[PDB]
Ligand binder design. Structure first.
Ligand SMILES: Cc1cc2nc3c(=O)[nH]c(=O)nc-3n(C[C@H](O)[C@H](O)[C@H](O)COP(=O)(O)OP(=O)(O)OC[C@H]3O[C@@H](n4cnc5c(N)ncnc54)[C@H](O)[C@@H]3O)c2cc1C
Length: 453
């Protein structure tokens, strides 16, 4: 068979593309192809809102409670929206179908055709690659035995949540490895769970403080203290020597002489993009940043675009980049869909990131953020509406004595990245400040733009 629009991967970016195509051309035939057996679902609530629900059948519905009491589904759309695969070419002025449980194992660029794992062959006219990425495993655990790995989770797709949620009510001690935002989002999840279950939740990492690769020492620490406060044993400066089983329990040997005894391990340590198809089709990978190299219009070659986590693209303001955001998967995927219908537009939009550690703490981020860069923070006492619960009350979604502040990351006294600590709805102002990029003289005056005095 054949289809005029072929989206590889069933992701957040892959969906955003199909919506944007069918908006510009209301009769288009679109076929997503998913390795995953499940239909397009957003990822963020897997580590946050789905733990803070009181329905014990949430595991089955996947209907979450936002911080404002509202309900929502993890699935982007119901299965009524989508049409069937077999009847897509035939159904007249038809919609958008998806082919679950099938992996695209070869790309023939000059043939405008792909092969699937089962031997199938689909030709196409326009094609998107939106494969996302594979979770990294810890080199300590790679070396360890077979018995050791059977108690080690990675976190990404739903099954990983269902797995760990069951494990949560079964054992006494669970250890989270990684200082990243996901690592911490998960620690605070088990933390609230621990207030009733009385289990042991440990977060350990080689870094000095929580999110210490991005946040400056003052806030990185404050956050370490805030995560502790939520019922967690935080262990900074932990370099894992070796891991093994002994006496029905895992034992983590640290390089600094300490030893940890626990029942289960979750590894939250970054993302390896799925550039597996780059060989067979002969497309270019970026050796620095990783992923598929594409231009400012997200194009790899004639008839092939790439978006989401998997896309190393060219921002003209900031330079060549690659980002693993949700907002990015959405906006990039949407643009790529416009270009597949001829719009030939550049990626002028600046993607944004957010995180929530309970409904009492929240971070917003845009641009180039890094602890290594020189940093200026401006802080002030937080008020009643400065928290993610109170902000969700207002719009109520998934982002369409100091308590709050702003952090400028800079290079030549001109701002190139921004982090916001419990300051909400002021993202459009941060976007303006990066795009403009002037020689700001007093960053105290710039902070007044985020209501910081
Ligand atoms: C727990 C969690 C929490 C997160 N929280 C936040 C947050 O708070 N804020 C934020 O901005 N971002 C967050 N993210 C990031 C966001 O979910 C990702 O950036 C988003 O999933 C990217 O969309 P994507 O389509 O590019 O990748 P994905 O959504 O991973 O989609 C890729 C899909 O394509 C499939 N695929 C891959 N290769 C093939 C192939 N060869 N053939 C067929 N199918 C294939 C994969 O199986 C996968 O299902 C979070 C992610 C996770 C996992």
């Amino acid at each position: 068979s054949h289809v005029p629009f072929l989206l590889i991967g069933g992701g957040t970016a892959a969906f955003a593309a199909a919506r944007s195509i069918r908006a510009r051309d209301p009769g288009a035939r679109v076929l997503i192809v998913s390795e995953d057996p499940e239909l397009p679902y957003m990822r963020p609530p897997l580590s946050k809102e789905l733990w803070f629900s009181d329905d014990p059948n949430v595991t089955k519905t996947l209907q979450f409670r936002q911080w404002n009491g509202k309900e929502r589904s993890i699935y982007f759309q119901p299965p009524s929206f989508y049409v069937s695969a077999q009847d897509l070419p035939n159904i007249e002025n038809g919609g958008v179908a998806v082919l679950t449980g099938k992996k695209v194992v070869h790309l023939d660029v000059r043939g405008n055709m792909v092969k699937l794992n089962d031997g199938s062959q689909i030709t196409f006219e326009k094609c998107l690659i939106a494969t996302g990425g594979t979770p990294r495993s810890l080199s300590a655990i790679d070396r360890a035995g077979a018995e050791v790995k059977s108690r080690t989770t990675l976190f990404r797709k739903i099954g990983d949540f269902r797995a760990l949620e069951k494990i949560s009510r079964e054992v006494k001690s669970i250890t989270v490895i990684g200082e990243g935002f996901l690592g911490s989002e998960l620690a605070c999840a088990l933390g609230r769970k621990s207030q009733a279950s009385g289990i042991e939740v440990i977060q350990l990492f080689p870094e000095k403080g929580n999110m210490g690769k991005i946040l400056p020492q003052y806030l990185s620490n404050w956050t370490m203290e805030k995560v502790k406060r939520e019922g967690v044993k935080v262990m900074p400066n932990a370099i894992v020597q070796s891991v093994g089983v002994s006496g029905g329990r895992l034992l983590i040997k640290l390089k600094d002489g300490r030893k940890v005894e626990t029942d289960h391990i979750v590894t939250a340590v970054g993302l390896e993009p799925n550039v597996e198809l780059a060989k067979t089709g002969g497309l270019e990978i970026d050796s620095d940043f990783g992923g598929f190299r594409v231009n400012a219009e997200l194009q790899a070659r004639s008839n092939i675009w790439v978006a989401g986590d998997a896309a190393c693209f060219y921002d003209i303001k900031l330079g060549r980049r690659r980002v693993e955001h949700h907002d990015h998967a959405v906006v990039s995927g949407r643009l790529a869909g416009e270009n597949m219908t001829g719009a030939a537009k550049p990626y002028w939009h600046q993607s944004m990131f957010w995180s929530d550690l309970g409904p009492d703490v929240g971070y917003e981020a845009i641009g180039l953020v890094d602890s290594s860069l020189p940093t200026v923070g401006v802080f002030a006492k937080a008020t009643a509406q400065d928290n993610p619960k109170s902000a969700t009350e207002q719009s109520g979604t998934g982002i369409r004595d100091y308590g709050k502040g702003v952090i400028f990351y800079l290079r030549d006294k001109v701002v190139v990245g921004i982090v916001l600590w419990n300051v909400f709805n002021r993202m459009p102002i941060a976007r303006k400040i990066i795009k403009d990029g002037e020689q700001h003289e007093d960053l105290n005056e710039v902070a007044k733009l985020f209501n910081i005095h």
